[PDB]
Paper text:
Recognition of viral antigens by CD8+ T cells requires successful folding of the major histocompatibility class I (MHC-I) molecule and β2-microglobulin (β2 m) with peptides typically 8- to 10-mer in length. The peptide binding groove of MHC-I molecule contains six binding pockets, A-F, which span and accommodate the binding peptide from the N-terminal to C-terminal. A minimum 8-mer peptide is required for structural stability of the peptide-human leukocyte antigen (pHLA) tri-complex that is contributed by two amino acid residues of the peptide that serve as “anchors”, one that fits in pockets A/B and the other in pocket F4–6. The overall structure of HLA-A*11:01 in complex with various peptides (SSCSSCPLSK, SSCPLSK or SSCSSC + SSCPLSK) is similar to the standard MHC class I molecules.
Continuous and unambiguous electron density was observed for both SSCSSCPLSK (10-mer) and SSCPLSK (7-mer) in the antigen-binding cleft of HLA-A*11:01. Overlaying the Cα-atoms of 7-mer (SSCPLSK) with 10-mer (SSCSSCPLSK) peptide revealed a r.m.s.d. of 2.16 Å. The 10-mer peptide adopts a 3.4 Å bulged conformation upwards compared to its 7-mer counterpart; as P4-Ser and P5-Ser of the 10-mer orientate towards the exterior, while residues P4-Ser and P5-Ser of the 7-mer are seated in the cleft and thus adopts an extended conformation. Despite having an unoccupied A pocket in the antigen-binding cleft, SSCPSLK is held with the main chain amino group of P4-Ser hydrogen bonded to Tyr7 and Glu63, and interacts with Tyr159 and Tyr171 via two water molecules. Moreover, the side chain of P4-Ser makes a hydrogen bond each with Glu63 and Asn66. At the C-terminal of the 7-mer peptide, P10-Lys anchor residue is bound to various residues of F pocket in a similar manner as that in 10-mer peptide. Taken together, the results provide strong evidence that peptides <8-mer can form effective bonding to reside within the peptide binding cleft and provide overall stability to form pHLA complexes.
Residue numbers in the entry:
A (entry chain C): 1 to 7
B (entry chain B): 1 to 99
C (entry chain A): 1 to 274
The structure:
């Protein structure tokens, strides 16, 4: 799995 | 914007009275994810029913499989009860062994 | 042939009733292999295929960290998107995220994906070039600007072209018995009178893997597509799938009809005739 980013 | 479940009720293998099998209720094409699905044996809720983990299709609509071990018989009548915000009342869909 | 790895995240606000729920699943082609549920007791990413169980603790600990940080991220974003759309704090809403990669027969990178929805609708997507973003609306334009400034695309691209594809190859090799087997459909026909003059012909495909299949009915060699009832392809529950196609036929004229079955596991397409 991949790592988060904020909206 | 909401979408009402498509509902399929069926057995894992073609059904033979006296042979252990799985009763499946597959719900798909729905939004939102919040839903209750019960399997009924002669109008009565079967207590131990498992389900798949929540996933969704390329159109964002959710899908789930509810299932239980069962040994069908001539007289035992099975159905699937789907309770969703799009349905004014729970939809009961009954097991037809050729669908 | 070609293969995919896809992760699907769903986060749901429940106003008044505490923190949002976050669920995560991972798939390689049509086989699920992991899950995470923020409501469950383990608070761990869990195996759901036999072949992923051989990953050591450091794999599980990292994967659990990733989904937890995602669930937390989605928690903040659920609030932010309520702001952007001027929504009350009383409604339930939903963020969904799909990402992943495809590889070819030789194992090389084919493509990568990352797409986000809000309440069941397109919100923002990474373009096939892995460099730019498509916002569905005004709210998502704001997100897009944050992601441009933050260079989010570069970070996403590095994952999709690297780690995503490496682990997909690894899972394909470690699960090759199940992941690279094709299960052909087992076919038969059913037949039920509706009337003295009309009857259902139903063509069945069972126990096939992967899910992709085509079932078509033909009269005298001519496609019947408008008069075919088709059900969605459905899981049997054991890793394989099922589908059927039915036509209503004049009693006596069944021999004119042919069901045609196409699937990867079939050397040749099947023809069935009642």
């Amino acid at each position: 799995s991949s790592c988060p980013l904020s909206k | 914007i909401q979408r009402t479940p498509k509902i399929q009720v069926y057995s894992r293998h073609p059904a033979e009275n006296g042979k252990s099998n799985f009763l499946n209720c597959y719900v798909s094409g729905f939004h939102p994810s919040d839903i209750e699905v019960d399997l009924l044996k002669n109008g009565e809720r079967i207590e131990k029913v498992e389900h798949s983990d929540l996933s969704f299709s390329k159109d964002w609509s959710f899908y789930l499989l509810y299932y239980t071990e069962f040994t069908p018989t001539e007289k035992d009548e099975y159905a699937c009860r789907v309770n969703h915000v799009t349905l004014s009342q729970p939809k009961i869909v009954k097991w037809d062994r050729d669908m | 042939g070609s293969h995919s790895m896809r992760y699907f995240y769903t986060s749901v606000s429940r106003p008044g009733r505490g923190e949002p729920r976050f669920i995560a699943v991972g798939y390689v082609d049509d086989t699920q292999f992991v899950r995470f549920d923020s409501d469950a007791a383990s608070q761990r990413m869990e195996p759901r295929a036999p072949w992923i169980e051989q990953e050591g603790p450091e794999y599980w600990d990292q994967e659990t960290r990733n989904v937890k940080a995602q669930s937390q991220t989605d928690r903040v974003d659920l609030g932010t998107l309520r702001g952007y759309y001027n929504q009350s704090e009383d409604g339930s809403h939903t963020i969904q995220i799909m990402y992943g990669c495809d590889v070819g027969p030789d194992g090389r990178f084919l493509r990568g994906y990352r797409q986000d929805a809000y309440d069941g609708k397109d919100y923002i997507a990474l373009n096939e070039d892995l460099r730019s973003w498509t916002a569905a609306d005004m709210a998502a334009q704001i997100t897009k600007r944050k992601w441009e400034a933050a260079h989010a695309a570069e970070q996403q691209r590095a994952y999709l072209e690297g780690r995503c594809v490496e682990w997909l190859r690894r899972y394909l090799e470690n699960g090759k018995e199940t992941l690279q087997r094709t299960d052909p459909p087992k076919t038969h026909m059913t037949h039920h009178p509706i009337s003295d003059h009309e009857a259902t012909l139903r063509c069945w495909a069972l126990g096939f893997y992967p899910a992709e299949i085509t079932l078509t009915w033909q009269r005298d060699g001519e496609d019947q597509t408008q008069d075919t009832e088709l059900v969605e392809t459905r899981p049997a529950g054991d890793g394989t799938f099922q589908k059927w196609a039915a036509v209503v036929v004049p009693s006596g004229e069944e021999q004119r009809y042919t069901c045609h079955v196409q699937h990867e596991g079939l050397p040749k397409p099947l023809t069935l005739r009642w």
